[PDB]
Amino acid sequence: HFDVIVVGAGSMGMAAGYQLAKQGVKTLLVDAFDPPHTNGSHHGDTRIIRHAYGEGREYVPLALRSQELWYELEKETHHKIFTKTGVLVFGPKGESAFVAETMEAAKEHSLTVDLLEGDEINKRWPGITVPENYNAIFEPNSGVLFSENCIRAYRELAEARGAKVLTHTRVEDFDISPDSVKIETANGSYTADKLIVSMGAWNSKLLSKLNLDIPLQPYRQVVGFFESDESKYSNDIDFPGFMVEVPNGIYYGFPSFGGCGLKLGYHTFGQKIDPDTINREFGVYPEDESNLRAFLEEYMPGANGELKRGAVCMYTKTLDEHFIIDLHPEHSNVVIAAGFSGHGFKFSSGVGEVLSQLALTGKTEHDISIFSINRPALK
Ligand SMILES: *Cc1cc2c(cc1C)nc1c(=O)[nH]c(=O)nc-1n2C[C@H](O)[C@H](O)[C@H](O)COP(=O)(O)OP(=O)(O)OC[C@H]1O[C@@H](n2cnc3c(N)ncnc32)[C@H](O)[C@@H]1O
Ligand code: PRO
Ligand code: PRO
Ligand SMILES: [Cl-]
Numbered sequence: 001h002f003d004v005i006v007v008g009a010g011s012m013g014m015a016a017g018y019q020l021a022k023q024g025v026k027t028l029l030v031d032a033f034d035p036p037h038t039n040g041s042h043h044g045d046t047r048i049i050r051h052a053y054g055e056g057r058e059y060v061p062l063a064l065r066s067q068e069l070w071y072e073l074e075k076e077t078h079h080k081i082f083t084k085t086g087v088l089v090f091g092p093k094g095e096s097a098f099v100a101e102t103m104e105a106a107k108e109h110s111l112t113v114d115l116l117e118g119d120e121i122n123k124r125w126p127g128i129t130v131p132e133n134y135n136a137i138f139e140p141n142s143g144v145l146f147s148e149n150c151i152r153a154y155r156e157l158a159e160a161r162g163a164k165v166l167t168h169t170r171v172e173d174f175d176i177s178p179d180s181v182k183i184e185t186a187n188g189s190y191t192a193d194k195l196i197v198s199m200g201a202w203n204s205k206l207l208s209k210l211n212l213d214i215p216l217q218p219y220r221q222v223v224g225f226f227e228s229d230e231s232k233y234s235n236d237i238d239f240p241g242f243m244v245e246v247p248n249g250i251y252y253g254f255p256s257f258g259g260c261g262l263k264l265g266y267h268t269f270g271q272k273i274d275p276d277t278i279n280r281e282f283g284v285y286p287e288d289e290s291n292l293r294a295f296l297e298e299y300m301p302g303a304n305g306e307l308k309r310g311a312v313c314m315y316t317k318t319l320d321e322h323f324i325i326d327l328h329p330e331h332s333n334v335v336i337a338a339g340f341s342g343h344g345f346k347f348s349s350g351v352g353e354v355l356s357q358l359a360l361t362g363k364t365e366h367d368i369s370i371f372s373i374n375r376p377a378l379k
Contacts, residue, residue, distance in 0.1 A: 002028045002164075002192040004359050005183055007171045008199035009035050011042045011151065011345050012337045015352025016196050016359070018154040021161040025360065028190055030183065032202075034167040035155065036148035038280070040200045042345065044223050044311040046254050046263060047147040048241045049346035050087045052113060052139050054098035055321065057105035058370050062350045064109075069349035070145060077153035084143040085235060085255055090121060090136035091245035098245045102137050114138040125239060127232030127302050144241050144254060147345050154352075166190075171199075174209050176331050194359045196335045201275035201314040203338040210328060214378060216339055219270035219315040220278050222288045225261040226296065227305030233262045243267075244299075251295045262303040266291045267342060275314060282310025315342035319377060323347075325354060326373035327362065335359050336373060 004020055006013045009029035020027040033039050049067060053059040074081040091099040106113045116124065118132035130136075159165060166187065173184040174195070181195040199206055204216035233239045239255035239262075249268030256262050269291065282288055289307060296304035318324065318339035328334035335358045337351060344351070357364045369375075 002026050002190065004028075004194045004196065005030065005181065005190060005192040006196045006198060007183060008197065008202070009155070009165055010040050010198065010200050011147070011348040012340075012351050012355065013196065013198035014151050014154040014158070015348045016198065016337075016355040017163050017165075018158040019352045019356035020359070021158040021163040023356070023360075027158070027163045028166060028192065029158075029163060030166045030169050030171055030185065030190070032168070032170045036151040038311070041314050041316070041340070042147050042151060044263075044313055045146065045148060045260075046257075047145045047345040048087060048142075048243060048252060048254070049082075049145055050089075050139060050142045050243065052089075052102045052106040052109075052111045052137065054089065054102040054105070054243070055343060056370070057101065057108050059347070060105055060109045060111070061366070062347050065353070066347045066350035067142070069353070070150075073150065073153055073349065076157060079149040079153045080146050081150060081153065082143060082145055083235065083257075084141060086138060086140045086238075086240040087142045088125070088136060088138050088240040088242040089244060090130060090134050090242075092131070092247070093117070093133050093135045096245035098250065099135065099137065106137060106139070111139065112141060114140065127229065127239060127300055129299055129301060138240065145346065150348070171206070176210065176334060178333075181333055194333050194335070196337065196355050196359055198337040198355070201316045204316060205275065207336070207338065210334065211330065212328070212336070214324065214338070214373070215319050217317045218273050218275050218278075219317060219342070220273045221265060221267075221270040221313050221315050221342065222282055223263055223265040223311050223313065224282070224289065224292050224307055225263045225309040226292075226303055227308055228256050228262040229302035230256060230259060233300070233303050246295065246299070261305075261308045262300065264292045264295065266295070270315065273314070278312070278314065280312045282312055315340075317341045319379070322377075323371045324373050324378070325351060325368055325371040327358060329373060332362050
């Protein structure tokens with residue numbers, strides 16, 4: 001028996017477990033694998049954190065809280081957590097809602113940003129070649145998280161404080177009562193007062209076992225690392241992280257760290273998949289490499305060398321691409337964290353705090369109604 005069980009000890013679940021353990025709550029975390037791992041949504045080494053938020057100005061306080069928590073984690077562990085690369089956002093002037101909302105978000109929250117146009121972009125960051133009609137907003141104080149190290153650090157800190165992590169154990173079913181929760185696995189059954197459910201892409205398959213019917217679609221999302229001109233694209237010469245809008249969608253990427261090569265993903269396209277049958281080999285579809293080189297040859301031509309490494313990862317999308325962070329509508333002793341829609345990792349520190357509050361008290365300090373499980377746009 002525990003105070004709290006966390007099912008899925010990944011990005012959100014491990015952060016929640018640390019928050020609980022820190023408060024002396026007796027916590028069990030259960031995971032299908034041994035986090036961090038390459039079967040979920042957290043691998044590929046690096047994750048962008050932005051504060052000025054093109055998906056919506058209402059995420060900014062959560063972003064800023066999460067950033068402060070990431071600096072706190074850096075101080076507590078020997079693992080590397082965060083590098084302040086800055087984040088460049090650009091797109092054609094007048095033709096990117098994402099860029100426009102990034103700019104509005106920065107204004108509304110008085111964030112520190114630089115605004116640039118056309119050739120100014122290419123001049124400031126050798127290696128970038130945008131058309132003259134593009135504009136940009138650069139956020140100097142955001143950057144890059146080392147996501148596998150984040151999970152490892154939270155795990156080690158939680159375990160030192162008495163959290164138990166049961167690895168390689170799939171939760172197969174749930175039994176919820178008014179006064180207790182139970183999970184069923186092939187390695188045994190466990191009970192607690194409260195449950196947090198954070199199974200990433202598997203939320204789309206297993207939330208039905210809690211009598212929930214929520215549209216959730218897992219997507220197969222690849223990234224690649226490319227041999228690059230290190231005099232232009234290295235973190236050592238202040239090449240930024242980036243998230244940009246071009247006519248054919250949104251691309252994102254990372255400077256080369258220690259010669260790993262520039263890393264690139266295509267955000268707005270992926271294959272609809274089931275997490276149990278996804279093909280986790282990079283390059284099995286022509287789109288995997290070709291969509292990436294299409295961007296590199298046009299906008300970052302010195303980073304379009306040999307493919308050094310590929311990875312395959314999953315998003316879990318809601319209809320509105322906003323998260324789900326709430327109590328179960330029928331069971332106040334069950335907390336749901338789902339649907340992070342390809343943009344949740346940067347918030348995992350702050351979400352851990354929210355989940356711990358919801359589990360312990362049934363409430364949170366600030367409104368999180370944008371992530372309500374009851375909202376119309378979910379259905
Ligand atoms: C895939 C991806 C995502 C991504 C990104 C690039 C790629 C290629 N870039 C990002 C970026 O730069 N910045 C950012 O803020 N987010 C970015 N993302 C998205 C982000 O990585 C995800 O939103 C986030 O990782 C989601 O976290 P969540 O905690 O929901 O998912 P998870 O880490 O995969 O953890 C789920 C765990 O649950 C376990 N599991 C699943 N089923 C079970 C059962 N039945 N029993 C027990 N455990 C279970 C999994 O094993 C996993 O550990
Ligand atoms: O495919 C998609 O993105 C949406 C998300 C939930 C269900 N369908
Ligand atoms: O959430 C982010 O910042 C990155 C860029 C789009 C995909 N994930
Ligand atoms: Cl996701």
